[PDB]
Amino acid sequence: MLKYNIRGENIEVTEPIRDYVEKKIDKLERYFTETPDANVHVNLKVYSDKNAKVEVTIPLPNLVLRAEETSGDLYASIDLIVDKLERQIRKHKTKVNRKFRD
Amino acid sequence: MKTGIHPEYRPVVFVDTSTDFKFLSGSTKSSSETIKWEDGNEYPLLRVEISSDSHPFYTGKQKHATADGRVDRFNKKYG
């Protein structure tokens, strides 16, 4: 159960954009089998030269997930920000388990 | 009147402590008292709170309160 919070500046947070952000970051639940309910901080901003930025923070208890991206349009950045986040969950989880198993 | 299956119902004399209003009507409760009235009615002197001689609907209670006038109070309070 994830609770979102989008800080739309220099842009309008339309419902289609809200649905796109919610459904793409919602697939992270498969990895981290108990995601304690936490608040997601999402920021969007667009420049004058048609560049889009997304910043995500998901403060899981021992897992501080972040990723920030800059690309052409808004949708490419959101699709490319999952890869940076999924790496950190896979990095943090498999670091704990295999090391205590020498 | 079947015997042995009824609670005791000895007579009793009522007294109203509010205004000293004597009254006679037998009651089941013994109340552990003794007093004789009206040429001999020796029984418990059961005390009680206000009877029908002082209640609002059961007696002639006049006001026990006051009223309001509002606009009168506004005229009185303001001057």
Place this chain on the structure above:
Amino acid sequence: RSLKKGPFVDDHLMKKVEAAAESEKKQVIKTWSRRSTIFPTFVGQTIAVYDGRKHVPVYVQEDMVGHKLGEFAPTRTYRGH
């Protein structure tokens, strides 16, 4: 005025209804002063009170004496969620 020196009544509102006693609820009164306590002289009259963007009419009763005009002219428009 919530003190002994009161009550507080707006001049131009008080004078207008005072000369409207001949009308006897024959003219609507269009006023802005919401900070005037309702007087006994106001009873039976209908006044239009500015609620921030328009005038809303209220018929003065006896129960309304001692209150302010604005109490019967809600400002915020709430209709649930």
Place this chain on the structure above:
Amino acid sequence: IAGVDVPREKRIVISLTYIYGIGKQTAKEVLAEAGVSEDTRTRDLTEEELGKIREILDRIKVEGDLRREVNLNIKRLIEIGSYRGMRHRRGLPVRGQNTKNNARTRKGP
């Protein structure tokens, strides 16, 4: 006893406050005009003492008569159209306190 049952093991200064419309400070006067000591158990006062208290407490307002008066005032505001009426009729905080947060003691759970 004195309008309604009052506690027995308690004290008269404390026991009286168990009836609607009376409080700790007002219990000082009704125990002063009655001329009876404050530190007296309820199951110790005689009829003469209890009689004066009931006579003294009669002048002051009590439950029922006070319970209906306050509700009558609340009703008067509901249909007159005053602002406090909509607060009373909708359960939102009546006086001058906010509503964005912390209005649960009147709105409920």
Place this chain on the structure above:
Amino acid sequence: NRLKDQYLKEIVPALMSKFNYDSVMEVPKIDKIVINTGVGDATANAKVLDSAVEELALITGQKPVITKAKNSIAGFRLREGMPIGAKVTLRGERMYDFLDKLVTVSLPRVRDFRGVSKKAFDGRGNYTLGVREQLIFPEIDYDQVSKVRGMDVVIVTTAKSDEESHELLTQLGM
């Protein structure tokens, strides 16, 4: 005991020269008083029923008879024969004395004493009162009270219509 005496010595002439009755026995009187209680909540716990039974036996003077259900309504989780309620019937001296106690000392105990209902008549001369607090009757005590529960005192009169029952009750003191 006395209330019957005043009834048959002063109220009787008043009804006589107020209603212009032909003969003597046409004047109405009080036939019986029947008191009822409901323990429909005692479907599971059968002991609160018993507690109410000794309550009624104490308060009247005669033990009540436990009433059994006449149906098996599933809405009230009922089966036929389940003991529900109790009743005490007063006829004669006990009736008059109990009514006197009720009118002179029991009624001046209700929390909001404004007057008994003036429209509680079944339409044929019988009055049903609906007191719903336990120790309205002074006999029982607050400590002994285990569950606040109401009662149904019913007065059955020989009058043929409501109004003369109304005047008879007012003459008695209701």
Place this chain on the structure above:
RNA sequence: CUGGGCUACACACGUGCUACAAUGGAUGGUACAAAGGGUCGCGAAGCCGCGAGGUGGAGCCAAUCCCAUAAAACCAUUCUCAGUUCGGAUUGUAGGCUGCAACUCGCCUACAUGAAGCCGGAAUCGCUAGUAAUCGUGGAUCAGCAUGCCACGGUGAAUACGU
């Protein structure tokens, strides 16, 4: 320029204040500070009111007078483990004060009403000595309004093997 709004409210999050009582509540007596402000300003004695407050005008352009009685602590009585003599929200009535004006939308007082709450899940924060903890005091903004901010003092711990 007047009026309204920035004070909305099914709800979610962050930061604080008050509690869930006996090392405590209530009643009576009494001791001990530092740092600051005061001239269209501080405002004492006296008198009145249960109270918030009112009249009054002393002295002070201040190591001089006022703000200004410090509170926890100490000493006696009572309450006797309860949703209570704990807790105070909420609300009805009656008042005070500033301001031309207190309804939206101020602060305080008197009476009465008496709610959740009996130590808080997963998780998480601060602190190494006059520190944490706890109790009072003052100042800026200010006609009025701080549980916020910036400063002052009173009482006063536990623990640190170690990386």
